[PDB]
Amino acid sequence: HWMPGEPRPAYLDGSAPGDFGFDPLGLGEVPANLERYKESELIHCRWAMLAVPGILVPEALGYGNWVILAIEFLAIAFVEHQRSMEKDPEKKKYPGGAFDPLGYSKDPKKLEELKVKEIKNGRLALLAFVGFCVQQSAYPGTGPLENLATHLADPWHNNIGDIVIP
């Protein structure tokens, strides 16, 4: 669990997927707040997972680093409005229906294990995106793959001493 020896909040019993009893600020007391936060976390995880390879692949393929419009605005506004139109609390977190033609929802236990795996990978991808954003600030104009190569030059340490103490 989040850190052993700490009592968990009453609203986090360890039954929810990806739950580890983490709430040092207690921002999820109200049930409606918890449902909204669950949905928001799922959306963030999915977007970050979809985005990270789209940033990395350019540099690997040598096309460059990560550093029409009306159609895009219309499509995104329509998609988000249509998603917002849904009313069921359960269907918003997982819409199912025809969106999963491969039929991976047949097995319940496998479904729950997949849910836990997806949540964990989403947290990892979100942390990776934060890492990318902070990395760009320290070394302007340098992509993450070049930073990895420079680390491979000196595989000793995360070079924060060169930055934290100039």
Next chain:
Amino acid sequence: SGLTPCKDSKQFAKREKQQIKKLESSLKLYAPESAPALALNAQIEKTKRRFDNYGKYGLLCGSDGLPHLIVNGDQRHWGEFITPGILFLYIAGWIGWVGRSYLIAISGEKKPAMKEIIIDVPLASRIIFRGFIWPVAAYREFLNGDLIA
């Protein structure tokens, strides 16, 4: 911020020279060995040492020839405001903690109002030493929840 150091302030030098010249004007009125002249001669040296010390500490003078104080937190001027501030805070906390601890001790008596006029010196002398560790005492009491009624 457009300020110059004391040691390179022509107006500072002019102020020192003018004060010395004014002081020496009254020295000529008395005999050199007389007591008023001896007392006056001790004033000139005090002025000279004060000006030398002000120049030696890196104080900043403006166009007036008068030192200015910088309290924005610069590490080169921590002696102007930051260093004396912590000392005052420590002393005031000592006084407040002693005063608060005396009242609590006598609150349980049958007539606590009588001890506020005729101070119990043997009881007060014991509490006085306890104010030395007031920061730790207050930090521990805040966590336990006994600070606020």
Next chain:
Amino acid sequence: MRDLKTYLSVAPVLSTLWFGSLAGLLIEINRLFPDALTFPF
């Protein structure tokens, strides 16, 4: 006597003694470290 101690512990006399000692001390530092504007330590 006991009355002598009791009269000496009354608020005005004790306050006057404390403030006199305080003023003497403050004059002592002001004489020992005259014309002070910054901490040289």
Next chain:
Amino acid sequence: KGEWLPGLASPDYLTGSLAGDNGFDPLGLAEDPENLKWFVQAELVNGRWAMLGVAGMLLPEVFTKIGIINVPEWYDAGKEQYFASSSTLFVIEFILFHYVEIRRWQDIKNPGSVNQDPIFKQYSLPKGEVGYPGGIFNPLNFAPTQEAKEKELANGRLAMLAFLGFVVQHNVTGKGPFENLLQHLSDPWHNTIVQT
């Protein structure tokens, strides 16, 4: 039970069950029973760390003086260069000490909460009083009787005093810790704090 000042009654909150008790509390800092536990743990940790520091900053000076090795004093060790930058070593220390310190803090809050290994589930420490982990930390399996605890606390207090003395020695005289002792023994009645 020892008394730190004959003719003075000991405070009531010091029942004498704790190790290294002498009824010494003129300021009454441990009036609240909760504060007593935290203060006890802080005293233990400070004693152990001060003991290690005093030993490690006194012995090499003696070794250099006798002639076995050639090592500078304790205060100037920072000027020497090492195989890694000081910032790098600080980064290793900062990450590394966080784990152990958080583990100890978790034990202090809930006793016996962190006794189980988090990676391998079959290894754990035996139950014991807080502040004395035992187990793997006591490989030779010495008896943790009250006498040994009293010895540890006395040595820790002496080490605290010695460390403060060393710091004040360097601040005023500006010489080495062991150099001062030899200077004192040459003319005991002419080389003292009075002269300096």
